[PDB]
Amino acid sequence: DSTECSNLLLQYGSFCTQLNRALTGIAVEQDKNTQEVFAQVKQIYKTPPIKDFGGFNFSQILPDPSKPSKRSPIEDLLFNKVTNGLTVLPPLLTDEMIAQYTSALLAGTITSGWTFGAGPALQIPFPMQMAYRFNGIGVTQNVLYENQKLIANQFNSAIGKIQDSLSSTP
Amino acid sequence: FCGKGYHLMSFPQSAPHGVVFLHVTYVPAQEKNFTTAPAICHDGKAHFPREGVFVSNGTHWFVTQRNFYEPQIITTDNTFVSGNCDVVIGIVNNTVYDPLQPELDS
Amino acid sequence: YTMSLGAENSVAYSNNSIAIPTNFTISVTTEILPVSMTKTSVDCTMYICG
Numbered sequence: 001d002s003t004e005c006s007n008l009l010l011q012y013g014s015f016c017t018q019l020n021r022a023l024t025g026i027a028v029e030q031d032k033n034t035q036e037v038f039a040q041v042k043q044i045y046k047t048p049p050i051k052d053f054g055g056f057n058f059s060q061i062l063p064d065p066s067k068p069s070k071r072s073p074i075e076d077l078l079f080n081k082v083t084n085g086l087t088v089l090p091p092l093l094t095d096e097m098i099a100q101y102t103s104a105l106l107a108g109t110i111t112s113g114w115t116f117g118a119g120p121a122l123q124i125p126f127p128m129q130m131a132y133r134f135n136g137i138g139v140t141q142n143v144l145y146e147n148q149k150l151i152a153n154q155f156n157s158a159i160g161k162i163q164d165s166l167s168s169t170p
Numbered sequence: 171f172c173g174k175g176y177h178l179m180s181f182p183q184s185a186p187h188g189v190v191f192l193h194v195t196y197v198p199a200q201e202k203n204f205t206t207a208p209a210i211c212h213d214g215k216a217h218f219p220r221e222g223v224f225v226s227n228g229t230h231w232f233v234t235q236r237n238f239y240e241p242q243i244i245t246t247d248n249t250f251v252s253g254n255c256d257v258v259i260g261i262v263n264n265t266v267y268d269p270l271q272p273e274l275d276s
Numbered sequence: 277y278t279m280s281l282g283a284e285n286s287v288a289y290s291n292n293s294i295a296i297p298t299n300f301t302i303s304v305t306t307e308i309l310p311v312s313m314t315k316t317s318v319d320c321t322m323y324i325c326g
């Protein structure tokens with residue numbers, strides 16, 4: 001609040017304008033980064049009420065209705081595990097909207113595979129989608145269909161191990 | 171990476187201190203519902219599509235390519251056999267045509 | 277206002293139904309990428325001292 005200091009500071013020119021402009025550029029760049037990463041779909045996809053995916057369990061990654069934040073158990077664990085003229089500008093996208101974007105991406109990739117990323121979302125059963133992914137890596141569809149229960153059990157076990165590993169590693 | 175949709179090709183254009191890429195992509199449109207099955211049960215054998223998918227318009231079963239609707243008769247030439255019908259969940263019963271059958275029939 | 281992310285689109289998922297495209301659109305999109313800047317040189321002695 002010193003007037004004499006500001007009068008002497010005016011002798012140095014537009015340094016303050018340069019610093020404010022650089023900080024403003026960084027601040028808008030962070031919002032642009034969040035838009036580029038999370039806002040890649042213009043349709044908010046939602047999962048069906050019945051979670052019949054041929055044995056595949058997505059409860060640890062889909063949003064929890066019981067939680068007020070509408071986050072997944074994994075996302076909730078992630079948020080729990082992260083802890084004089086200065087101002088902090090809030091991000092343009094809040095945490096619930098970012099979670100909503102991730103939920104839309106999860107619903108699109110579960111119910112439609114990769115179709116929603118290239119155009120209209122085309123529904124496909126999840127085992128058939130997994131079989132398509134198996135063909136992508138050079139394994140025949142029959143292998144997926146014959147061992148579907150084993151693949152679903154392995155996927156559920158791995159997702160649970162991911163949650164346990166995140167909860168158990170500082 | 172090269173536009174929204176399935177990338178077909180791209181064209182470069184010069185710009186002042188920059189480049190403009192015209193990405194030509196293929197976008198699916200006018201989609202239609204069909205009833206689908208993982209495999210076709212015929213003669214105690216499970217048949218799987220070689221490159222396409224089994225679709226049904228309500229009464230008849232066909233095999234088509236995944237990115238465009240082009241229904242074709244389910245034959246031994248576009249399907250492959252792996253195992254019986256007891257293992258695959260959701261296998262449905264349908265006939266599988268044999269192109270060689272009218273040749274020895276005549 | 278509170279911004280809207282996108283229009284809601286509930287995909288009609290079921291365990292035995294698929295959606296197959298019957299047509300296509302050849303879509304051309306633009307992507308603009310900067311390549312170079314203006315090449316500026318500053319004579320440090322002449323700038324500071326003339």
Ligand SMILES: *[C@@H]1O[C@H](CO)[C@@H](O[C@@H]2O[C@H](CO)[C@@H](O)[C@H](O)[C@H]2NC(C)=O)[C@H](O)[C@H]1NC(C)=O
Binds near residue numbers: 051057058059060
């Ligand atoms: C999907 O996985 C979730 C989580 O593993 C299962 O929920 C569990 O259900 C058992 C049995 O009722 C409970 O004892 C656990 O406490 C539940 N865990 C959680 C985190 O809620 C769920 O049953 C699985 N299956 C389906 C169809 O959702």
Ligand SMILES: *[C@@H]1O[C@H](CO)[C@@H](O[C@@H]2O[C@H](CO)[C@@H](O)[C@H](O)[C@H]2NC(C)=O)[C@H](O)[C@H]1NC(C)=O
Binds near residue numbers: 227228229230
């Ligand atoms: C599903 O497609 C098949 C084949 O295009 C349809 O079968 C044809 O139906 C027409 C209409 O009566 C007949 O004139 C043809 O002779 C049929 N073809 C054969 C090979 O039988 C079938 O009707 C379609 N089903 C629905 C519900 O649209």
Ligand SMILES: *[C@@H]1O[C@H](CO)[C@@H](O[C@@H]2O[C@H](CO)[C@@H](O)[C@H](O)[C@H]2NC(C)=O)[C@H](O)[C@H]1NC(C)=O
Binds near residue numbers: 211263
């Ligand atoms: C598909 O065909 C198979 C074999 O023709 C059917 O399986 C038979 O089902 C009857 C009735 O339950 C049993 O008595 C036979 O012993 C079964 N045979 C075999 C080899 O398993 C099957 O039910 C048919 N499915 C449909 C939907 O028509």
Ligand SMILES: *[C@@H]1O[C@H](CO)[C@@H](O[C@@H]2O[C@H](CO)[C@@H](O)[C@H](O)[C@H]2NC(C)=O)[C@H](O)[C@H]1NC(C)=O
Binds near residue numbers: 202203287289
């Ligand atoms: C495929 O069938 C589904 C089920 O009927 C259609 O989904 C419904 O479409 C109507 C028409 O707008 C909506 O009012 C319903 O809410 C939709 N249901 C669900 C669960 O989303 C779907 O539109 C059909 N697809 C095509 C291409 O005809």
Ligand SMILES: *[C@@H]1O[C@H](CO)[C@@H](O[C@@H]2O[C@H](CO)[C@@H](O)[C@H](O)[C@H]2NC(C)=O)[C@H](O)[C@H]1NC(C)=O
Binds near residue numbers: 200298301
């Ligand atoms: C596929 O979509 C194209 C549009 O991209 C359709 O072409 C149009 O067909 C209508 C009806 O005859 C014409 O009035 C338009 O002028 C056509 N547009 C162009 C650019 O040619 C085409 O008919 C559709 N095909 C199917 C099978 O649905």
Ligand SMILES: *[C@@H]1O[C@H](CO)[C@@H](O)[C@H](O)[C@H]1NC(C)=O
Binds near residue numbers: 261
């Ligand atoms: C789909 O689910 C219904 C019950 O919701 C079941 O009767 C049917 O057999 C299932 N089909 C497949 C292919 O899993």
